[PDB]
UniProtKB/Swiss-Prot annotation:
Signal peptide segment: none
Additional free-text comment from the UniProt record: Present with 2915 molecules/cell in log phase SD medium.
GO-annotated biological processes: engulfment of target by autophagosome; intracellular phosphate ion homeostasis; microautophagy; polyphosphate biosynthetic process; polyphosphate metabolic process; protein localization; vacuolar transport; vacuole fusion, non-autophagic
Residues of the full protein shown: 202 to 553 of 828
Entry similarity comment: Belongs to the VTC2/3 family.
Protein name per the record: Vacuolar transporter chaperone complex subunit 2
Recorded GO MF terms: calmodulin binding; inositol hexakisphosphate binding
Domain notes from UniProt: The SPX domain has very high affinity for inositol polyphosphates, such as myo-inositol hexakisphosphate and 5-diphospho-myo-inositol pentakisphosphate (5-InsP7), and moderate affinity for inorganic pyrophosphate. Its affinity for inorganic phosphate is 2 to 3 orders of magnitude lower. SPX domains may integrate inositol pyrophosphates (PP-InsP)-dependent signaling to adapt cytosolic phosphate concentrations to different metabolic situations.
Record organism: Saccharomyces cerevisiae (strain ATCC 204508 / S288c)
Length: 281
């Protein structure tokens, strides 16, 4: 309450797993989700998240669909305190560079000003202000920058107004480098919050992606957030089944860093989840 459990699901079992969940939870009803994770060039956040030091926050920009359609963009900081705490800010696209590269305070200022004018309670205005400051200071203090993106499609299962259980399955998971590490020819321009090729509004925006710039993850990732390892019993039948493979402490952030940069001599440590196994057997 609330506990998170993560599983890998083989493509061969994906449809059966979905049909089983659907018997107990309605499904929300194609667009890619983009999650663009931050770290510094020493991979400190990755190191902490894997060793489990310093509350091990992760930080990402998240938006759905094609950046062209002007989606909402979230900047989200997640920290495990038995319970994950999430600080989530909605950022207007054109302020992102200033906010993450230049310590700009003006988007916060304008936002609070508007909300205050329209009648948001003081206690709320103040909480929002703390959220802005905590995320920006986190970025500045630790020299965080956008490093890599995960892209995937999500199927989400959830009974309205019911907290007990909630289930997501993410498929088509791909990791893509988006760092400004190289002083010449950085993948992402150092003053631009995202690499601009893959977000271009064109037929194939992945045209210029190089092999060493992406990695595919082979399984779907199912997360069950509950109020198996650490009404309720379809859950047991499912998760004690050959159909899902529970993976204690799985982190998509850690996996993406390892998959992309492990062969590039940036990392001292790698996760060992125990992907040589056939997860079906």
């Amino acid at each position: 309450n609330f506990r998170s459990f993560k599983f890998w699901v083989h493509n061969d079992n994906l449809m059966e797993v979905k049909t089983r969940i659907l018997r107990h939870l309605p499904v929300l009803v194609d667009p890619l989700i983009n999650t663009l994770y931050f770290d510094n060039e020493h991979f400190e956040l990755y190191n902490d998240k894997l060793l489990k030091l310093n509350s091990a926050p992760t930080l990402r920009l998240r938006w759905t669909g094609q950046l062209s359609d002007k989606p909402d963009i979230f900047l989200e900081k997640k920290t495990l305190i038995s319970e994950f705490d999430l600080t989530k800010l909605q950022l207007k696209q054109k302020f992102i560079n200033g906010f993450i590269f230049e310590g700009d305070k003006k988007f916060k200022e304008q936002t609070l000003k508007k909300l205050k004018e329209s009648g948001t309670a003081g206690r709320d205005l103040e909480r929002l202000e703390e959220d802005f400051s905590e995320i920006q200071n986190f970025i500045i203090k630790n020299e965080l920058q956008p490093v890599f993106r995960t892209v995937y499609t999500r199927t989400a299962f959830q009974i309205p107004g019911d907290d007990k259980i909630r289930v997501t399955i993410d498929s088509n998971i791909v990791f893509i480098k988006e760092d400004s590490f190289d002083r010449e020819r950085p993948i992402r321009d150092p003053n631009t919050w995202h690499r601009t090729d893959i977000d271009a509004n064109v037929a194939n925006p992945l045209k210029f992606l190089r092999g060493g710039e992406y990695a595919k993850f082979p399984y779907s990732v199912m997360e069950i957030k509950v109020k198996s390892m650490i009404h309720g019993q379809w859950l047991n039948d499912l998760t004690n089944s050959h159909l899902v493979k529970e993976i204690p402490k799985f982190s998509i952030f850690v996996q993406g860093v390892a998959s992309l940069y492990g062969d590039d001599e940036k990392l001292d440590i790698l996760p060992f989840w125990l992907l040589e196994t056939d997860i079906r057997q």
